[PDB]
Amino acid sequence: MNPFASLTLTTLIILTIPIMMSNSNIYKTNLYPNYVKTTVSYAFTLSLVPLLMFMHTGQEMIISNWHWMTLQTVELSLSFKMDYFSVMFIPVALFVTWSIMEFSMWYMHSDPFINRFFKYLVLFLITMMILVTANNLFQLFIGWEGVGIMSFLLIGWWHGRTDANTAALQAILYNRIGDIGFVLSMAWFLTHSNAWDLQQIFMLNNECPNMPLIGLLLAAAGKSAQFGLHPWLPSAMEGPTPVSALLHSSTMVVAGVFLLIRFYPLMETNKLVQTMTLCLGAITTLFTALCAITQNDIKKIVAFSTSSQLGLMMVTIGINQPHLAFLHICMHAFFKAMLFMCSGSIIHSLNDEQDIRKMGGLYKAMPFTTTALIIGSLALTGMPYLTGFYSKDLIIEAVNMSYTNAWALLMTLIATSLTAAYSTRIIFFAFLGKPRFPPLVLINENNPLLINSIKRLLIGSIFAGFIISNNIPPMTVPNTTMPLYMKMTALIVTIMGFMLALELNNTTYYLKFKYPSQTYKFSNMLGYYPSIMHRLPTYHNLSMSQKSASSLLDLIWLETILPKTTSFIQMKMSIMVSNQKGLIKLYFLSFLITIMISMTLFNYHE
């Protein structure tokens, strides 16, 4: 019973205070953003103490606080599980969002609803460390939609932008398709393993979780924006820059991957399931990167570069490498979060322009932003001894050094080469060139808020993996005897990809006209997915709803079979009964029939 368990939980109760203070409305209506930024800072500072306690000892907590309600044999209770996967994530996650908050005030220095904006970010935050810290599947399901709905409002921050609502509607849709798999896993675990706490599921050793794991995989694909369920994340750049910098870069989009890491022990028992985990990661890596190197918006480039990373993360969890995938969460949190407000720096400074074809020569104009981007891009490519090397170079070596699908392994190499490819495209068009923006120049980065925020992660990204790899206990099996030819592949492919991408990029400088290649017509159009899947299925289901369904059944048939038919029959036989002549000759004739038939025909007398 050390302070570890006590103060790992208060960190959560630290950063919920700004939410309560805002509802008072006595809260400072001017310096509110500073209030939350400092609050997250203290939440970060508190968060190290559980961390520092960890690598020394190695104790991970499960605290079962107030018992919500008990269901016969089920005891659904608010319980927080401070695993290594958790006790590490809160320190990095707040560290990133604290820097994002510092960048946020500078970037969004004119938005009149800025107090609302910072409130939303915190509300998103709370939904996050209750997702990662979730001892039971139910409160894990709490975050899985708490973050999703929070994204919808944040994405549609500019409510009037009709496309932003469409993107916001798009995000919740693709998430809910994944959410379908989530409840399927919840239903199976409760029906078979009779619980939702992760402890009972592991102990009940459901070593044949065919349907559960498929449900978990489907849940991850929607949240982590995989093939079939990716395009919401690239389309989610319509929100403001810090919004994409925090949620859809390295904090919320990675949650889907984090789900498998939580349920890794059950996944490794199965063999079939991890196939399409690395299969889906393989296709996601290539396709997102393939569309990445042809886009013309920095937000589009970076976001696709993310989805390629989450394609890469699931490749490792494919072949029994959960913690290395979690290791990749750590590094991706640093440098990927960087590239956004680094890009956001150029966007705001160069009059909110996001078309990569308008910069050039920014190397000398914004030396710090240019310096920040080159370190970030090199980290993403996986330059040795800095951030990405400690994870990606290990991962590429890891999946290569295993019994995997041959086709799956090949795409990871192509993706890594393509990973460097769009990195050159950004550095080439944006920085290495000549000015192309409007004549009046307003380039500026001297604001301390932008400088401090970027520098704060810079020192983080420079060392990064060195500290984490050296600190965490040695808890994955390290392969040792690589035939040098494939151990260099982690560096050969990116260096190779660096070469031609540079050659292809400065071929634009060559005076020769660029004829439109059909592959370019394919890659540049988001890989043709949004044009079809966002127009054909939506039209059919919508046309079914109105033409058929409502009009055909609800307003035509269902109102005619039971109600109108009886109403018609009653009216059709109300008129002929009431349509009498008034002449007794016919009435008395009817009586004579009645007397005649009743007396004899129906045997009433006998």
């Binding site: 009059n351 322009e353 409007p438 004549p439 009046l440 307003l442």
Partner: protein, 86 residues
């Protein structure tokens, strides 16, 4: 962004027409109608407004682009589109 005011617009405006070698600097007037006196062909008029478009960073609709016809009128349509009154 400092308030872009109509005096700055015309300064930037006539900066570009004077830049246009087809309109040498000497006879630029604020209301110098292009083909009436400068002889600038209307086919190049649909070309000087994209120069304006990048100059101030926004799109000029075609409905009025063909109507954007004089440097003063160039400035006039610029001001209201960005509520420039000072």
């Amino acid at each position: 962004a400092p308030p872009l005011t109509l005096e700055a617009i015309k300064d930037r405006v006539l900066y570009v027409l004077k830049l246009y070698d087809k309109i040498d600097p000497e006879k630029l007037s604020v209301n110098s109608h292009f083909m009436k006196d400068l002889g600038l062909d209307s086919l190049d008029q649909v070309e000087i407004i994209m120069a304006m478009e990048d100059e101030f960073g926004f799109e000029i609709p075609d409905i009025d682009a063909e109507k954007l016809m004089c440097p003063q009128e160039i400035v006039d349509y610029i001001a209201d589109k960005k509520d420039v009154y000072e």
